[PDB]
Design a protein around this nucleic acid. Structure first.
Length: 557
DNA sequence: AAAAAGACTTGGAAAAATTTTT
DNA sequence: AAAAATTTTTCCAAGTCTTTTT
């Protein structure tokens, strides 16, 4: 182990002093198809050249996916699959609709069938294989210590698949070559040798970054990286600091609210726009809303990027007055609909930036993340739209606890409302078939284990009844042994009852990871002797190894 | 100050592992 | 074992924010 958190923090600016690694692990060569796995065009058989058979297969491996039916996918795919076609093959294949892939598909399926039940030796064999790879490449060296590499395996080539109505879906992710990679490391570390007879694209030494490799995505023309694992004194130190910055805000929070509140009424167009945006960002945990290069990602939004056509306005609605009806496509394209009753002053004000605008006009023109953060970073150091979602939620957790953690009860009773309370604190964020109806043939079943040890237990009396010794009275203590062991096996599922029914559409996998100070939980643990291993899992504990070792029941966010 | 590039963190989906039911 | 129900892991897109550049 290595308690880096007890170490003296680095100067502002520098990230590391020494860096060394074996670079990346490119993808495996293309394995051509057996002579007996045929492709078809216009019914006629056809043996595609490598690069084209390669792209051809990415489609085949996806046939059964509805994605393949959508226009933009079939459009984009062909467009590219064509690029990768040999001149003589282009004159033949002109549509992709006459292309019978049914064979290649049927081929890979069986291939998966053979991989879904193979030699118990092949399993333990490859498991020894992957581990082998994870020994040479899965780790790197940063400043006097070996530290885990997050994603050493480079992205294999294949058909791109964005989220939602993505315009690029179907395009082809090219296979990265040692020529497209950039290794980083220090001026004094040993530069890793690119595969036999190849060459890196650049080998810069830069202690200002934290990445080991990096190449550009040829689809969005963006940048991919390869960075350390969560347990890094580099990823963690930043996550820790993430929860620290949220703590500061925990002080001057009230001073910012009563602030921007008396900001809605500002003669200046700017400001009055900012404060509103900022308002929702605090009330409905929205996302800043950084503008998007039109055409690259599917149409989606955020607070700052909201258009007049995304919000409606009702003076009086569903009883409550002054209502702003939000309805737009958020991140990943997970829709956000929710009528919200705001402040009278915010509604009239909201209506302000509502005149002289078509539905496709920026609701908050003359405002944007830049201005918004630039200001929050004046009101407080490092404060940025985001910190809010982490602060609010973070405090409700330390809250909910003293709201449902009895001063002494069965463990389950704790982990009960614990992972139950924090539920509403993972849906106000809005994070998103035959499984529950499958609880009866189970719950009813084990629940009957109740009446099991219920009747009997009567044998606790029936037996040590008239009888008056101690040998017999040894069946009564055993009775109650089946009593907490099952009553729990009853209470140990009473949650999933309130969970899955109050946590369906709104998932919370982000909650128990990001936005919540792990200390809030690690201290609560130590407090009631509850084991950490019970809430978090093998990996989690490893990312929060700092929040475990240095937090006492005495901790307060 | 404005846009574009570069850098990280967020977060859901799919594949893989482990457990539980048939 | 075989199958289905869960949980943990891998994977990478999509965002936020920060720096660079003009």
């Amino acid at each position: 182990k290595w308690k880096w958190w007890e170490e003296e923090r680095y100067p502002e600016g520098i990230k590391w002093k020494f860096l060394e690694h074996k670079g990346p692990v490119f993808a495996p060569p293309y394995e051509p198809l057996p002579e007996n796995v045929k492709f078809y065009y216009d019914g006629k058989v056809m043996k595609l050249s490598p690069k084209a058979e390669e792209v051809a297969t990415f489609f085949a491996k996806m046939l059964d996916h509805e994605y393949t039916t959508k226009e933009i996918f079939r459009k984009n795919f062909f467009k590219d699959w064509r690029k990768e076609m040999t001149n003589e093959e282009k004159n033949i294949i002109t549509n992709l609709s006459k292309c019978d892939f049914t064979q290649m598909s049927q081929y890979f399926k069986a291939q998966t069938e053979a991989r879904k039940q193979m030699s118990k030796e092949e399993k333990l064999k490859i498991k020894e294989e992957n581990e082998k790879l994870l020994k040479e490449y899965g780790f790197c060296i940063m400043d006097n210590h070996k530290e885990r590499i997050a994603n050493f395996k480079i992205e294999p080539p294949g058909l791109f698949r964005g989220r939602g109505n993505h315009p690029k879906m179907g395009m082809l992710k090219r296979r990265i070559m040692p020529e497209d990679i950039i290794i980083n490391c220090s001026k004094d570390a040993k530069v890793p040798s690119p595969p036999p007879g190849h060459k890196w694209k650049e080998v810069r030494h830069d202690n200002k970054v934290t990445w080991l490799v990096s190449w550009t995505e040829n689809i969005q023309g963006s940048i991919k990286y390869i960075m350390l694992n969560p347990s890094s004194r580099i990823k963690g130190e930043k996550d820790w600091q993430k929860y620290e910055t949220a703590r500061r805000l925990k002080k001057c929070v009230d001073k910012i609210r009563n602030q921007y509140r008396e900001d809605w009424k500002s003669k200046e167009m700017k400001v009055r726009q900012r404060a509103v945006a900022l308002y929702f960002i605090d009330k409905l945990a929205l996302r800043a809303g950084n503008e998007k290069e039109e055409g690259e990602t599917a149409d989606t939004v955020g607070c700052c990027s909201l258009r007049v056509e995304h919000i409606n306005l009702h003076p009086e609605l569903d009883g409550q007055e002054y209502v702003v009806e939000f309805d737009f496509l958020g991140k990943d394209s997970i829709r956000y609909y929710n009528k919200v009753p705001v402040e009278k002053r915010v509604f009239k004000n909201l209506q302000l930036f509502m005149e002289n605008k078509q539905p496709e006009d920026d609701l908050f023109d003359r405002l944007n993340t830049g201005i918004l953060n630039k200001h929050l970073q004046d009101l407080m150091e490092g404060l940025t739209a985001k910190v809010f979602r982490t602060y609010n939620a973070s405090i409700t957790l330390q809250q909910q606890l003293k709201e449902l953690t009895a001063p002494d009860e069965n463990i389950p009773a704790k982990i009960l409302s614990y992972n139950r309370a924090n539920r509403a604190v993972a849906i106000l964020c809005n994070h998103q078939e035959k499984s529950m109806m499958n609880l009866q043939t189970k719950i009813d079943a084990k629940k009957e284990q109740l009446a099991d040890a219920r009747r009997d237990l009567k044998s606790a009396k029936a037996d040590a009844k008239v009888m008056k010794d101690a040998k017999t009275k040894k069946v009564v203590e055993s009775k109650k042994k089946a009593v907490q062991r099952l009553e729990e096996q009853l209470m140990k599922l009473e949650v999933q009852a309130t969970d899955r029914e109050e946590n369906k559409q709104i998932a919370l996998g982000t909650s128990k990871l990001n936005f919540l100070d792990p200390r809030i939980t690690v201290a609560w643990c130590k407090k009631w002797g509850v084991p950490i291993e019970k809430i978090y899992n093998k990996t989690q504990r490893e990312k929060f190894a700092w929040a475990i070792d240095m937090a006492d029941e005495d901790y307060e966010f």
